[PDB]
Design a protein around this ligand. Structure first.
Ligand code: MMH
Length: 261
């Protein structure tokens, strides 16, 4: 399809990022509600990321999963690039965390199950995720989690909070990156901040490289066990997604079945 900007009525700004603004929008003919992400070419080219976006968009076009945000299409004019995206009405996990301070074990294990399901589906088709931040997790009409960043690779910053040691130490990274991501998110969901949070990039780099973190008292033995298994310095020592999905703390607390499958 040949989409142009006049094909859509543009509504309220949903959010802003470094490169793009996201707007609620509705396709004029069908009245289909969606989100339009608007990115400036000149800015993308200046940062050296236009190709990276192109590759991520191509990867994203292949992913069809209830817990992955859908890319409907794209287009451009002289100035900018427009991504036609699924509208996730309940907004970001980042914002939900800010409002609730921390999540209970049931919400947390349901979210981790949903992420593990989405990542399992991605791994099955040779697709790996880079780091996963709560700002880049959206919530659908029924509160289902949607991975919304296009941060994929067949094989292809920044705050360091969500990056694994092998990505910051200049090492080799594989499908085990997104296992680390699960460990960071599991901890952040339960505690209200990520495990290596610090005042400086420099303090954070060191905490990540050393895997230097501690649990507050309220974190239960089951959650500690899962988080400690995922946050291993050596990628090869991290579990398979199957193991995450079968973990007794996950199975006892999740509201959602662990569709591996
Ligand atoms: C109360 O403020 C909001 C409530 C809900 C939203 C939902 N946005 N949902 C989206 N659907 N599809 C896409 C793409 C988006 C999106 O990127 N939203 C977005 C982006 C950046 C920041 C936020 N902020 C919040 C608070 O949700 C939302 C956005 C703002």
């Amino acid at each position: 399809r040949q989409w142009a900007l006049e094909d859509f009525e543009i509504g309220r700004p949903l959010g802003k990022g470094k490169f793009g603004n996201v707007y609620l929008a509705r396709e004029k003919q069908s009245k289909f509600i969606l989100a339009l992400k608007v990115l400036f070419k000149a800015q993308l080219e200046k940062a050296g990321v236009e190709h990276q976006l192109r590759r991520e968009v191509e990867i994203q076009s292949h992913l069809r999963h209830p817990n992955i945000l859908r890319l409907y299409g794209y287009f451009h004019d002289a100035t900018r690039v427009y991504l036609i995206l699924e509208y996730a009405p309940l907004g970001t996990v980042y914002r939900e965390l800010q409002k609730l301070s921390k999540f209970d074990e049931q919400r947390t294990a349901t979210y981790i199950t949903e992420l593990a399901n989405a990542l399992s589906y991605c791994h099955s088709k040779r697709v790996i995720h880079r780091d996963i931040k709560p700002e880049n997790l959206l919530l659908g009409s029924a509160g289902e989690l949607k991975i919304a960043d296009f941060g994929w690779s067949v094989h292809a910053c920044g705050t360091l909070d969500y990056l694994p040691p092998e990505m910051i130490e200049g090492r080799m990274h594989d499908e085990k990156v997104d296992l680390w991501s699960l460990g960071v998110l599991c901890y952040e969901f339960l505690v209200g901040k990520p495990p290596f949070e610090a005042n400086t990039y420099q303090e954070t780099y060191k905490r990540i490289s050393r895997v230097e973190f501690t649990f507050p008292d309220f974190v239960t033995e089951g959650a500690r066990d899962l988080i400690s298994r995922l946050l291993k310095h050596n990628p090869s020592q991290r579990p398979m997604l199957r193991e995450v999905l079968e973990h007794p703390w996950i199975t006892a607390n999740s509201s959602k079945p662990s569709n591996c499958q």
